[PDB]
Scaffold this active site. Structure first.
Site, PDB file in Angstrom:
ATOM      1  N   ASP A 190       0.807  -1.228   0.000  1.00 15.44           N
ATOM      2  CA  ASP A 190       0.000   0.000   0.000  1.00 15.44           C
ATOM      3  C   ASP A 190       0.842   1.281   0.000  1.00 15.44           C
ATOM      4  OD1 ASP A 190       0.458  -0.893   2.750  1.00 15.44           O
ATOM      5  OD2 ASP A 190      -1.078   0.567   3.444  1.00 15.44           O
ATOM      6  N   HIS A 212       3.565   0.501  13.420  1.00 15.58           N
ATOM      7  CA  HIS A 212       2.931  -0.408  12.475  1.00 15.58           C
ATOM      8  C   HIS A 212       3.939  -1.292  11.771  1.00 15.58           C
ATOM      9  CE1 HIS A 212       0.555  -1.705   9.035  1.00 15.58           C
ATOM     10  NE2 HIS A 212       1.552  -1.258   8.286  1.00 15.58           N
TER      11      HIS A 212
HETATM   12  C1  LIG Z   1      -0.661  -4.273   2.466  1.00 16.39           C
HETATM   13  C2  LIG Z   1      -0.918  -4.301   3.981  1.00 16.39           C
HETATM   14  C3  LIG Z   1      -2.392  -4.427   4.365  1.00 16.39           C
HETATM   15  C4  LIG Z   1      -3.225  -5.403   3.791  1.00 16.39           C
HETATM   16  C5  LIG Z   1      -4.580  -5.488   4.190  1.00 16.39           C
HETATM   17  C6  LIG Z   1      -5.099  -4.610   5.145  1.00 16.39           C
HETATM   18  C7  LIG Z   1      -4.265  -3.650   5.736  1.00 16.39           C
HETATM   19  C8  LIG Z   1      -4.436  -2.654   6.740  1.00 16.39           C
HETATM   20  C9  LIG Z   1      -5.704  -2.344   7.470  1.00 16.39           C
HETATM   21  C10 LIG Z   1      -6.015  -1.021   7.736  1.00 16.39           C
HETATM   22  C11 LIG Z   1      -7.164  -0.697   8.435  1.00 16.39           C
HETATM   23  C12 LIG Z   1      -8.036  -1.694   8.828  1.00 16.39           C
HETATM   24  C13 LIG Z   1      -9.326  -1.341   9.569  1.00 16.39           C
HETATM   25  S1  LIG Z   1      -9.125  -1.332  11.376  1.00 16.39           S
HETATM   26  C14 LIG Z   1      -8.099   0.061  11.776  1.00 16.39           C
HETATM   27  O1  LIG Z   1     -10.419  -1.131  11.999  1.00 16.39           O
HETATM   28  O2  LIG Z   1      -8.470  -2.588  11.767  1.00 16.39           O
HETATM   29  C15 LIG Z   1      -7.729  -3.006   8.503  1.00 16.39           C
HETATM   30  F1  LIG Z   1      -8.604  -3.980   8.895  1.00 16.39           F
HETATM   31  C16 LIG Z   1      -6.578  -3.352   7.819  1.00 16.39           C
HETATM   32  C17 LIG Z   1      -3.192  -2.042   6.880  1.00 16.39           C
HETATM   33  C18 LIG Z   1      -2.764  -1.019   7.855  1.00 16.39           C
HETATM   34  O3  LIG Z   1      -3.085  -1.268   9.047  1.00 16.39           O
HETATM   35  O4  LIG Z   1      -1.891  -0.168   7.547  1.00 16.39           O
HETATM   36  N1  LIG Z   1      -2.319  -2.557   6.016  1.00 16.39           N
HETATM   37  C19 LIG Z   1      -2.934  -3.559   5.322  1.00 16.39           C
HETATM   38  N2  LIG Z   1      -0.170  -5.352   4.696  1.00 16.39           N
HETATM   39  C20 LIG Z   1       0.302  -5.166   6.005  1.00 16.39           C
HETATM   40  O5  LIG Z   1       0.240  -4.117   6.581  1.00 16.39           O
HETATM   41  C21 LIG Z   1       0.905  -6.425   6.503  1.00 16.39           C
HETATM   42  N3  LIG Z   1       0.657  -7.388   5.452  1.00 16.39           N
HETATM   43  C22 LIG Z   1       1.063  -8.823   5.478  1.00 16.39           C
HETATM   44  C23 LIG Z   1       2.491  -8.931   4.803  1.00 16.39           C
HETATM   45  C24 LIG Z   1       2.413  -9.156   3.266  1.00 16.39           C
HETATM   46  C25 LIG Z   1       3.757  -9.216   2.528  1.00 16.39           C
HETATM   47  N4  LIG Z   1       3.622  -9.048   1.100  1.00 16.39           N
HETATM   48  C26 LIG Z   1      -0.056  -6.747   4.358  1.00 16.39           C
HETATM   49  O6  LIG Z   1      -0.421  -7.283   3.359  1.00 16.39           O
HETATM   50 ZN   LIG Z   2       1.743  -1.448   6.306  1.00 18.47          ZN
HETATM   51 ZN   LIG Z   3      -1.229   0.382   5.786  1.00 17.92          ZN
END
Ligand SMILES: C[C@@H](c1cccc2c(-c3ccc(CS(C)(=O)=O)c(F)c3)c(C(=O)O)[nH]c12)N1C(=O)CN(CCCCN)C1=O
Ligand SMILES: [Zn+2]
Ligand SMILES: [Zn+2]
Length: 232
Positions: free
Chosen positions: A89, A150
């Protein structure tokens, strides 16, 4: 029609911009990951007659659409981009940016993590950010490393002309109850890192999270609270 965009108001495969302050916009796009759909934010800051971009729009096609939206809405060239951590992201779309002639930047930590993860890799390393509390200037913004939150590499961005704090994924929106995707987080250090942000930017007027709605300074304390409750 003027409200902050959400997944329900962004057409499929498109990007929306939102004016935050004079010469400051956020960008909003949506992406699917593991079978769920999420919004995410980035920043655009006017840099004389050029633009500084903060973060991709979460994917190659979304980032191409971001460039087109910027041309339509603003009409100044994006010359530089900074990615605020290594996740898709933030860096997914860096190849699109680079092929469009945008110079892409991230900390050395972010670049290492992106490479190791198989994510797209910004070209240029941002030195001077390796210790918590470090800050450097980059065009019309200050980049600040608050410590692990984070992710271990997450940066925050301040726009001094407008008192805009872009927290990135170290900061959550007010409506959150949970702490997002914590796979790479340091839940124990995160509150300390937020405290450092609060101490460094006490005059912030707008705080923009990595996902969801901007607000005021309350987003910082709220984030500390949600993270502590998750850890608990
Ligand atoms: C690409 C990224 C990723 C994917 C999907 C969702 C999110 C979220 C996220 C934000 C808000 C909420 C709503 S809430 C506050 O109410 O919970 C949520 F539900 C999830 C965030 C974040 O919090 O910034 N980021 C995400 N991401 C990571 O951050 C770690 N990861 C695994 C490693 C992959 C390696 N290729 C991943 O794919
Ligand atoms: Zn992240
Ligand atoms: Zn994020």
């Amino acid at each position: 029609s003027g409200e902050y965009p959400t997944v329900n108001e962004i057409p499929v495969g498109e990007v929306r911009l939102y004016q935050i302050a004079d010469g400051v916009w956020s960008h909003i796009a949506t992406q699917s990951f593991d079978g769920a759909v999420y919004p995410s934010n980035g920043l655009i800051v006017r840099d004389g007659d050029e633009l500084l971009l903060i973060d991709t729009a979460w994917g190659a096609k979304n980032t191409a659409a971001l460039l087109a939206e910027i041309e339509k809405q603003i009409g100044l060239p994006v010359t530089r981009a900074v990615s605020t951590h290594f996740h898709d992201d933030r860096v997914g779309g860096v190849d699109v940016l680079r092929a469009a002639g945008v110079a892409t930047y991230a900390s050395p930590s972010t670049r290492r993590l992106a490479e190791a993860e198989g994510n797209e890799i910004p070209t240029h390393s941002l030195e001077g950010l390796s210790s918590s509390g470090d800050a450097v200037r980059f065009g019309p913004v200050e980049l600040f490393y608050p410590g692990a939150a984070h992710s271990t590499d997450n940066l925050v961005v301040y726009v001094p002309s407008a008192n805009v704090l872009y927290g990135g994924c170290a900061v959550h929106e007010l409506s959150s109850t949970s702490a997002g995707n914590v796979a790479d987080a340091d839940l124990a250090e995160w509150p300390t890192s937020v405290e450092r942000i609060q101490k460094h930017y006490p005059e912030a007027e707008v705080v923009i999270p990595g996902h969801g709605l901007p607000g005021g300074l309350d987003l910082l304390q709220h984030t500390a609270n949600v993270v502590k409750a998750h850890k608990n």
